[PDB]
Design a protein around this ligand. Structure first.
Ligand SMILES: [Ca+2]
Ligand SMILES: [Ca+2]
Ligand SMILES: [Ca+2]
Ligand SMILES: [Ca+2]
Ligand SMILES: [Zn+2]
Length: 316
């Protein structure tokens, strides 16, 4: 809408208080005009009709518990936008400052979140397996990174390219959680998953196998569930990114870590520069070795760690 930019305050899903950019014209709207063409948050009102209605508030205070998922969806889309701009000189998900849109309160008891080709969508969860999914910065950044991938490499969402697509979203969701320093870890979804059971998460990058995901290519899922395992085989790539960043020994292969920023730069370059829609894990290894080389030299430690890590997880 057209109006005056202002700043509101509210409480997120985990009860933390934060400031949000709003726009005022009779009502206060969750419309942030300070980032590209804007960040817009919508109420789907427990239906599946999208996007729903632009979130309108009477007094620019967002402390109702109904408001909480909107506060976080709005705030964390902003943080993710800033991460891509400041760390990678990318303006929004398309590189040309496209509007970021999210809808919350999608359906009833819906335990998921997704990018639907045009916008992000967040369920409220059923209160026992999930609470509102936008309460996790790694969840928000994961979903938005799907749009980034769609505008760049265009990884097909099935089999090995699909697992790559999933892993890139886990990798970057984590790097964003670290960038914002929101209690970071190498776990996915720990803040919003199973409120009655602490210390667990949906997926683990540091040890995928903790939840039954492969951490080695020999162990990959070859059937047809989950579009050929896209959320399952991502574990192999997730473990690789973890080793590359933090180091460690995995099936007897030692890896010297090169830290997060270099992991980010290497994978962002692979993604934007070398990956294609049909790329497989072997092509990802090559893309990553080539980015490292481009960035740090044919005989750098960095290139050596990237080689080490992919060997460790069985990807030649
Ligand atoms: Ca209010
Ligand atoms: Ca965390
Ligand atoms: Ca996490
Ligand atoms: Ca939990
Ligand atoms: Zn995903």
């Amino acid at each position: 809408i057209t109006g005056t930019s202002t700043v509101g305050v509210g409480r997120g899903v985990l009860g933390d208080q934060k400031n949000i950019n709003t726009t005022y014209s009779t009502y206060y709207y969750l419309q942030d005009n300070t980032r590209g063409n804007g960040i817009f948050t919508y109420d789907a009102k427990y239906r599946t009709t999208l996007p729903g209605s632009l979130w309108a508030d009477a007094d620019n205070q967002f402390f109702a518990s109904y408001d909480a998922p909107a506060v976080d969806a709005h705030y964390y889309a902003g943080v993710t936008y800033d991460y891509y701009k400041n760390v990678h000189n990318r303006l929004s998900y398309d590189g040309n400052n496209a509007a970021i849109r999210s809808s919350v309160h999608y359906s009833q008891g819906y335990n998921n979140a997704f990018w639907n080709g045009s916008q992000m969508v967040y369920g409220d969860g059923d209160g026992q397996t999930f609470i509102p999914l936008s309460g996790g910065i790694d969840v928000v950044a994961h979903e938005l990174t799907h749009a980034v991938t769609d505008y760049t490499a265009g990884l097909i969402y099935q089999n090995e390219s699909g697992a790559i697509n999933e892993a890139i979203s886990d990798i970057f969701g984590t790097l964003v959680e670290f960038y914002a320093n929101k209690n970071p870890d190498w776990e996915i979804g720990e803040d919003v998953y199973t409120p009655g059971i602490s210390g667990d998460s949906l997926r683990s990058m540091s040890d995928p196998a903790k939840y039954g995901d492969p951490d080695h290519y020999s162990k990959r899922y070859t059937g047809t569930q989950d579009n050929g395992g896209v959320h399952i085989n991502s574990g192999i790539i997730n473990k690789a990114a973890y080793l590359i960043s933090q180091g460690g020994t995995h099936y007897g292969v030692s890896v010297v870590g090169i830290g997060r920023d270099k992991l980010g730069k290497i994978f962002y370059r692979a993604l934007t520069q070398y990956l294609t829609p049909t790329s497989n894990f072997s092509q990802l290894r090559a893309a990553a070795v080539q980015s490292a080389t481009d960035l740090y030299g044919s005989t750098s430690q960095e290139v050596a760690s990237v080689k080490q890590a992919f060997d460790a997880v069985g990807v030649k």
